[PDB]
Amino acid sequence: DETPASYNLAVRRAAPAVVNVYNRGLNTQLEIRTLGSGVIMDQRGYIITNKHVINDADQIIVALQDGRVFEALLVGSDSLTDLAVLKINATGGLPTIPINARRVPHIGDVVLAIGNPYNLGQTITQGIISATGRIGLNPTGRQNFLQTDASINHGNSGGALVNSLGELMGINTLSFDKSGETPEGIGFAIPFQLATKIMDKLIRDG
Amino acid sequence: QFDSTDETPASYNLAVRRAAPAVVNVYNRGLNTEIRTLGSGVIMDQRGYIITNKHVINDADQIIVALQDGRVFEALLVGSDSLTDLAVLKINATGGLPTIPINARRVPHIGDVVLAIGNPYNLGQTITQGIISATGRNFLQTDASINHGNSGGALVNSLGELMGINTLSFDKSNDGETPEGIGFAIPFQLATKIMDKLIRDG
Amino acid sequence: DSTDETPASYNLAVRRAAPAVVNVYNRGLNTNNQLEIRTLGSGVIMDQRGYIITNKHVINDADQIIVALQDGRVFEALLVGSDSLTDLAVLKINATGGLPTIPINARRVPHIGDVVLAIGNPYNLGQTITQGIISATGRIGLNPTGRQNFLQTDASINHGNSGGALVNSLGELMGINTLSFDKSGETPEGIGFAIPFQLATKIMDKLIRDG
């Protein structure tokens, strides 16, 4: 009869495209040095993630929720936005993140943060968009960040922030951790319109 | 400006009215000349059997259970499982008891809205909201704010059906930060399973 | 293809209430003009005449109180009075243009489990909206808050939210957020408090006429 309130539809549509990203180094036989998340943006195997997640890695590994694991190639990065692009080569079709180029994020929109915090396995948290940028000078030093109260922890960087429909809203960045009060529910994401742009460029140029 | 007088507020009150009455305050009392630990428990059925956390009731001289309707009962320990950290309590069922809604056919799905029900910091029964963040961790992971005092309490969906028994939050911190919104619960099917064994073996 | 579906959202509540929640700054002197920010909080414009509700703690010991609206207007606020008993303060601003006001439905009764949005200015990041539910509406017995009429919510509250608003999905004022419950032992998660709106309206009116 009756069904529980749920955001499972958005999960089923978007989670398959969000991947766990492992940065591995020399060690001296390789080991995990940095951990993060990433989003499969296209059928060809292009994945977005944060630049600080893959910096100075000797081997980047990408693990999908279906169980596939691939070695990924660094296609290029951008420090100004801390975005990086990876490339993987799969035989079977790759799941992609739903993108509605014409959807406009609104303050108060329900959102789900998808990533791999503390390497516990893919995790989905829920919140809303708290702000869609600032006009004046603020402590973040930026003007186009999306702010959300969906729990973000280390390991979430490079992951997806989607809406109740499963559409990409942005890429989560590092979390706001200290002041030294302990901030609660204050996270940031690079707006998706800006992530697509930076990607197309990096793919063909950078 | 406008009139919202007849509009209806979004709410999970239906789940509260149906589930919260069966979630009790569990007090671990000791000798001093007193409360040692405190947690929550879920009344599982009319027989008076209650599920809670093993760590909440360890080494107790007297275990007290308090219902939201005002009644207080002394509970006897029926059994506990080191492996899952669950424990079963027993109070006198005469006079009828509120029980937690259970839909044995309901399967929890990642993304389902959940409410954590317990007594954090002994502030009084508290309801927090989140979603099922993951399953098979056999633990359910949730971002419903959980605090000391919530252990042994309930995790229910918007219909008020039990999804699991809350245990602890994630504490591992690397650079020195505090994990946010990462809590665990034992899936209701498994908890039911353990309870049956604990009761039977008792 | 979701192109035609509608994303779940509380944007309606934000558009109705947020414009009336202001940023409150407490400025004082320091070393050697030289008026700096000493404390920061939020406030809610309750009446078109310009009366604003905030927390006493934020405006205590202030040489100058500044109030900034989300539309860009900045004013110097006048301290009308305080109520130590609830940490509520009333401010007055004199504006020519017309002021946005918080939606108040006096017949609405807050229920445990209702969705709520906290609106304020945490860490001076600029107006922020967080989401949760009402965890409790008062307590019958003696409890750690020492009071019986506090609203409790798990909507993330941070330093800066104080004096700000808590509204429901309709944008109706549920209460005025208090200082954030920051430390036990452990560090609490999702536990905040607010003064119920009906109580805040009575306190305001009395302070206006009397003191």
How does DSSP assign B110-172, residue by residue? TTBEEEEEE-GGGSSSEEEEEEEEES----EEE-S---TT-TT-EEEETT--EEEEEEEE---
In whole angstroms, how far apart are CA C3 and each of A9, A99, A112, A114, B84?
Answer: 15, 10, 18, 21, 45
**3-state DSSP assignment of residue B104:** coil
Task: Transcribe A7-19 into DSSP letters.
Answer: -HHHHHHHGGGEE
- Nearby residues of C41 by Cβ (< 8 Å), 6 or more positions away: C24, C26, C54, C55, C57, C58, C59, C120, C121, C160, C161, C162, C163, C164
Instruction: Name the token pair of A176.
Output: 């706001």
CA torsion B154→B156→B161→B163, rounded to 10°?
A: -80
Taking the domain C1-102, which CATH number applies? 2.40.10.10
DSSP for residue C9: B
DSSP for residue C2: -
Q: Which residue of C has its CA nearest to B127?
A: C135
CA C88/CA C200 separation, integer angstroms: 8
Name the CATH topology of B1-100: Thrombin, subunit H (2.40.10)
Taking the domain C103-211, which CATH number applies? 2.40.10.10
CA B72/CA A190 separation, integer angstroms: 52
CA-CA-CA-CA torsion sign (B139, B143, B147, B149) = negative
CA A117/CA C119 separation, integer angstroms: 27
Ramachandran sector of residue B59 (left: φ over 0; alpha: ψ -120 to 50; beta: rest): left
Q: Which residue of B has its CA nearest to C111?
A: B13
Query: Looking at chain B, how many residues does it have?
Result: 202
CA B152/CA B36 separation, integer angstroms: 16
Contact C118, C127 (CB under 8 A): no
| Residue from the list C7, C14, C190 with its beta carbon closest to the beta carbon of A163 | C7
Nearest Cα to B115, choosing from B99, B133, B131, B98?
A: B131
Residue C86 is labelled as binding a ligand: no
The DSSP element (H or E) to which A140 belongs, if any, is none
Tell me if C1-102 shares its fold with C103-211. Answer: yes
Q: What is the structure's resolution, reported in angstroms to one decimal?
A: 2.5
- Give me the half-sphere count of Cα atoms (radius 13 Å) on the Cβ side of residue C193: 20
Residue tagged active-site, from A52, A130, A151, A154? A52
Contact C64, C93 (CB under 8 A): no
Nearest-Cα distance to chain C for B14, in Å, is: 8
**Interface mutation vs chain A, best among B110, B141, B172, most A CBs within 10 Å:** B110
Nearest Cα to A115, choosing from C21, C171, B141, B146?
A: B141
Chain B residues whose CB is inside 8 A of the C133 CB are 11-12, 115, 127-129
Strands (E), chain C: 21-28, 36-45, 51-55, 64-68, 74-83, 88-92, 115-120, 128-137, 151-153, 165-168, 173-177, 192-196
Contact C101, C20 (CB under 8 A): yes
CA C97/CA C117 separation, integer angstroms: 28
Nearest Cα to C174, choosing from C139, C142, C131, C210?
A: C131
The structure's method of determination equals X-ray
Determine phi and psi for C8, rounding to 5 degrees: -60, 135
Place of tokens 């905030």: C54
Name the CATH topology of A1-97: Thrombin, subunit H (2.40.10)
**3-state DSSP assignment of residue A22:** strand
CA B111/CA B115 separation, integer angstroms: 12
CB contact under 8 A, B112 and A5: yes
| Residue from the list B158, B159, B174 with its beta carbon closest to the beta carbon of A154 | B174
In whole angstroms, how far apart are CA B83 and each of B15, B59, B172?
Answer: 30, 17, 20
Nearest-Cα distance to chain A for B152, in Å, is: 22
| Residue A128, beta-bridge partner list | A110
The DSSP element (H or E) to which C169 belongs, if any, is none
Nearest Cα to A146, choosing from A104, A177, A180, A178?
A: A104
∠ CA(C185), CA(C189), CA(C195), 5° rounding?
105
Q: Is A39 exposed, middle or buried (0-12, 13-18, 19+ CB in 10 A)?
A: buried
Name the CATH topology of B101-202: Thrombin, subunit H (2.40.10)
* Per-domain boundaries in chain B: 1-100, 101-202
Nearest Cα to A68, choosing from A49, A85, A83, A47?
A: A47
**Interface mutation vs chain A, best among C9, C117, C124, most A CBs within 10 Å:** C9
CA A189/CA B102 separation, integer angstroms: 39
Taking the domain A98-206, which CATH number applies? 2.40.10.10
CA A116/CA A19 separation, integer angstroms: 8
CB contact under 8 A, B157 and A10: no
Binding residues of A, by number, are 140
Chain C residues whose CB is inside 8 A of the A102 CB are 3
- Give me the half-sphere count of Cα atoms (radius 13 Å) on the Cβ side of residue B81: 20
**3-state DSSP assignment of residue C201:** helix
CA B148/CA B167 separation, integer angstroms: 10
Residue type, B11: S
CA C42/CA C63 separation, integer angstroms: 18
Q: Which residue of B has its CA nearest to C131?
A: B129
CA A75/CA A201 separation, integer angstroms: 11
